[PDB]
Amino acid sequence: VQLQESGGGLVQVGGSLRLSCKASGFTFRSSAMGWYRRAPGKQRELVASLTTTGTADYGDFVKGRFTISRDNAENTVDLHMNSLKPEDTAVYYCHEDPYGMESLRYWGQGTQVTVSSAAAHHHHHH
Ligand code: NA
């Protein structure tokens, strides 16, 4: 089982993103879902997660800027990110934990988020 991220790419400093993850589709059983990130050479760190019951946890660097939600009608876990900073640049990975068991964790493939105003203005034709 591999999940499928979308919504990454280039974004200006101060800009916003809507990250999405197509999960396993096994809505017949509960799960925890969330988002990690990994910057080159650095350790993976928790960005946001939801327990089986919908309790949210956020990495300390989030500082109220990101919101995690899940859509069971659409089989997704989503991350709404505002006020992106250069330091947020990293590969973002979603995950699903069947029955809340991290031991059975499914991961996405990762999607790059690059926070750069000059690059985003160039690429998005602003
Ligand atoms: Na942008």
Author numbering: 2 to 127
Study text:
The electrostatic surface potentials of the undocked sdAb flipped 180° from binding NP give an epitope’s eye view of each paratope clearly showing the prominence of the hydrophobic CDR residues that engage the basin. Both sdAb A and C appear to exhibit the classical convex paratope, with relatively large contiguous regions of hydrophobicity, while sdAb B appears less pronounced. Here, the main chain undergoes an S curve reversal (i.e., S to ϩ) to move Phe29 toward the basin with an ~11 Å maximal repositioning to displace the neighboring Thr28 which shifts by ~6 Å. The final position of Phe29 is almost a supporting role to Tyr100, but it does have modest contacts of its own. Amino acids Arg30 of CDR 1 and Lys1 of FR1 also move to meet their respective salt bridge partners on the overlooks with both having ~9 Å shifts.
Each sdAb recognized nucleoprotein (NP), a critical viral structural protein enveloping the RNA genome as part of the viral ribonucleocapsid and also a vital component of the viral assembly and replication machineries in concert with VP35, polymerase L, and VP30 (25). The last 64 residues of NP visible in the crystal structures primarily consist of three alpha helices associating to form an upper V-like shelf of the two C-terminal most helices (arbitrarily named 1 and 2 counting back from Leu695), with the third descending between them to re-appear after a turn as beta sheet positioned under the C-terminus. Electrostatic surface rendering reveals an asymmetric basin-like depression between helices 1 and 2 with helix 3 forming the basin floor with a hydrophobic core of Leu676, Val691, and Met683 at the closed end, while Leu663, Leu695, and Tyr667 reside at the upper more open end.
